[model samples]
Target: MKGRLISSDPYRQQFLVERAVSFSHRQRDCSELISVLPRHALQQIDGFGGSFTEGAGVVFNSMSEKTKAQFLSLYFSAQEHNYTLARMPIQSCDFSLGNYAYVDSSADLQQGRLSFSRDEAHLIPLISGALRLNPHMKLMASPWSPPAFMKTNNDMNGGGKLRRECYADWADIIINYLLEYRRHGINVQALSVQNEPVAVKTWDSCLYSVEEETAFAVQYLRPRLARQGMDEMEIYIWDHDKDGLVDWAELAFADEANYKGINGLAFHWYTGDHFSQIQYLAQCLPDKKLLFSEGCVPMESDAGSQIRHWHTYLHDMIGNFKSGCSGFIDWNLLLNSEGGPNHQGNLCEAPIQYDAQNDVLRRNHSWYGIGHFCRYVRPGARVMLSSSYDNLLEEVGFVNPDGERVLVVYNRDVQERRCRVLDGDKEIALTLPPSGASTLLWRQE
Candidate 1:
């Protein structure tokens, strides 16, 4: 197989594919390492993207119109990052300007005066622009908390249960929000019952036990959406960490009668990489999909200009792909120079950040780490098997929709490896830099 090698080497340059590296048909042992096995396929990819948080939206909208277009083009354009999926919050999150809900006044809820006026300034325009660039982009949304009026604590902050009397009202609120988004020319592709249901935060949050979430889905949510002819919308459960991910899925889907209400599972990356848990869940429930919904470096350690964090993104992406994640959603799409304008002081890094005082957009190592796979392994591509006998080499293979084969390799060890990729018959060999990553692609002649 012959292909182009796009290399991101620490010792050299970035996104450098100045010319294609040619192989002289050199051969190696069949049992050595890095075997690309098309026969041994894994889950199909739904593509990759980041969240459109209110903070990110505000920063984006604050930029000059040309800068906004440049940022969106670099991300949404097919010739660049090629992002196909995105996430948005139902209301206020830690990254929002402040705590807010569509129907803040109790009478507003009863009067059905739900509106997205809060998002009109930033979220709506940014999302609309992304839609204009990529009409087929899939958007998934999750609520940080229901309205304060709907929760037992009567406050968005701190964990509270949805008041029993407010269950039907909460259902109407969500469905109406989705409908309102559609009215504005943007369709939400899926929704999670709540964001991080198990964790209580000082910022906006709501709590639900496994049974509470499952019951709400079967009893209220499904029925509510069904009546409005929106049954086809996908319902995802547990938009939280992966420590007990499979166990939660077991409890939620244990009821045979209520199983169909949930389409799949969504999890965050804060609680360590329980990649094995994802694999186990995929094996036990082959019908359901696993989504890597959120991840980011903690604010404390996310020092500006420390490009080493690039490895963190690659390590998680390659691990999740092999472990059966259908898609990956990064945290915030962009932030300010100080890391954020987060009202809760919960600042974190993004792939792109704005140098507000200087008026410039900055890209980080994270940008290349994310784009390497997303730009190559497109939506609907099937993950192929790739075994590296040497533990120093980390990689994944894919067969794209256009019949092109892609292999993304990362060399973790301090010593360079003369890497060879085996795809049944064709043999291609090259030297990989130490502490570097490369994306390879080829088409059959």
Candidate 2:
């Protein structure tokens, strides 16, 4: 059989091309740690991507044309990262030029006067440019908070509750914002009600009880969008961490109306590995899509030494995909040298960073590690059934559009682990190193 092997380890850079070894059929015993790629399919993949925050735009829009073009080619090019799903905020979030909403004034906001002038200047242009490069990219919009006038606490930053009386008004503004993007030639395929619906951060945030989120979706958000002839747009609930995902799904999907109006669950990676939680979502609500909406590390400005950060991302990804994640979306696409110009000063590292003073763009190890999957695992790939009975090695596999079977395995053990890949009658011997990851691709000969 024809095969290709790519691996990354602590002692080596990512996606290292390894020498291919031939395989021979032999009798194996119970001690054999065989990875079986069964024919039963899992969820379909929607591909991988990163967020386009205003902090990213500040550097992206100002960089030399050559630099910006190269950056786009690296991430957006189908030959490179092959990123398809991108995320953006509805108004202002923590990572923005300032702290404000599209319609903040009580009188103007109550009247529902809105404008995309702020976005037109930076975000619109950046997205327009990205679409030019990768026209097939799908977009998702998320709101961090509603206008202060629509909140009980009358502020956007302190996790105020959404005033019950203003539910329709808030829903109108959100749908209008999405429709306005369409006028500007950007098609948003999905939206999340709030970024982190439970956390009241020093930055932009809004609070919602499980019942409140369900009500907003089934009562207002879903119906309004349908009125606007946008029923096709997918609405994801609980855009937060996995620790609360199971609870949110239990409450939200219990009501028939809630289940009909909502399309999926979007989650972040901050709360720790919750692969079992993902499994719960898949098994309990098999009809819903589980999207990894956001994840980032708050690292020092110069994070050139943080290789562990890369491994954590890969670990979470393997665990989630194996458990049943449809797509993976990272937090930020690019940041300035200091990680951000965040309005709340909530600095965080991205896969890419720019040095304005020196006119340079830097790609981190995390970027390299992500490429092993995104570059080869094309969108619309069917996640293949694979079993790695050993807990020390986490495995996820996919059958690509070209019919190639791709297996991504991560070794968390302290020493090399020998294994075999069983594809029907074929058995290929393999070796996984300690603290390393490998991607194997092949077609049955």
Candidate 3:
């Protein structure tokens, strides 16, 4: 079988070098073997994408029209990442220029005086641009916090809990937000109850214990959505780290009502890789979809750190997919040179960075690392069972809808390693450089 290989070796300053590779039937002795078993197919991939935060939108708007088109083509073109999924902040998160809400007071919500002017200003335009590029993109919305008036602490940040009496009102507000987006010609397919529900951040945030979150989803949100003709909207809970994933899922899913109400669970990587937790959820609740909702390299400024960050991204991705993550959504689509335009001074790195003063756009190594998967593994692909004999080579395999088989292998070690990819009796011999990643694609003869 004839195949192709695309590799990115930071040590050699090579990014996405492509070459032809042919499989040989000749017997050869290879100490390291990466095997792909197509019969053992796993979860079907939804797709890969990034969030479109207000900060990212501002950066996008500042670019020249030519640069903006280039950016869109690089991310949304069918030949590029072909991002089929995207996340948007419901109101305002830390990435916004400042904290704001759709309605300022309880009376406004009661009287139906809500407006989506804030989002229409910058966020919606950027999202509209992306939709124009890829009409098939799926969008999910998440709220960092409700309006201050609806919380006990009367604040958008600082770990305030939603007032129990306002449960129905809050539900209506969320539904209205969805309706507003729909009115603007944007269809949001999914909704998360809250972002980082357990943490108290100085930026826009809210707190909800296991019981509170479950009660909200089962009693308030789910029923209200159905009543409002939005029952088809997918509801995801636990938009936090993986450390408490199993415990949270156990508690939430224990109630049959919660299991029936919620569609899936969303998680982040800040707390480290608890891949086992995701595996547990996947194994126990085969019907639920696990999404890596958000993750990023925070507070990174040096350009040299791009290579190290690339490793970080791939390590987490391979582990997450191996454990049963069906979809992956990164933190931000773009950030400024200082990683700011953030109100709370919480800066983070994005795969693409824009130097507004120089009108320059740089695609970091992390971008190519992500492209290794998102570009090749199209939506509807099933994760193929794969294993490697050596720990130095981290790998994952997938079979796309069109019968193309994809294997992504990364060398985590600093030493070059020689390995062979075995598919049935056919083998492809290859060499992996230090901190190098390669994507191999072929179709069965």
Best by TM-score: 3
Q: Provide TM-scores for the models.
A: 0.95, 0.94, 0.97
Error of 1 at 290 (Å): 0.3
lDDT of 1 by residue, 283-310 (tens): 8887787888898874445443344567
Model 2 C-alpha lDDT per residue in residues 133-250, reported as the tens digit of each score: 8888889999998988889888888889889988988898888888888899999988888888889988889999889987887789888888888889888999999999898898
User: Per-residue lDDT of 1-445 in model 3, one digit per residue for the tens?
Assistant: 9999998888878988899989998366655889888778999878999999999999999999989998998899988889989999977899999988889996787688998887888788888988989988888999999988989889887879999998888888888888898888899888889998899999899999988988887898888888878878888999999999998999999999999888889999998988999999999999998999999997555776877799989999999998999899998999998887899898888999899999999898888989999999988898999899897799999999998999999999889988889888888888989989999999999
Off by over 4 Å in 2: 14-23, 26-34, 110-112, 300-305
lDDT of each: 0.84, 0.83, 0.89
> Which has the higher lDDT value, candidate number 1 or candidate number 2?
1
| Clash list (residue pairs), candidate 2 | none
Worst 10 residues of 2 by lDDT: 26-35
lDDT of 3 at 293: 92
> Which scores greater on TM-score, model 1 or model 2?
1
For every model shown, the clashing-pair count is 0, 0, 0
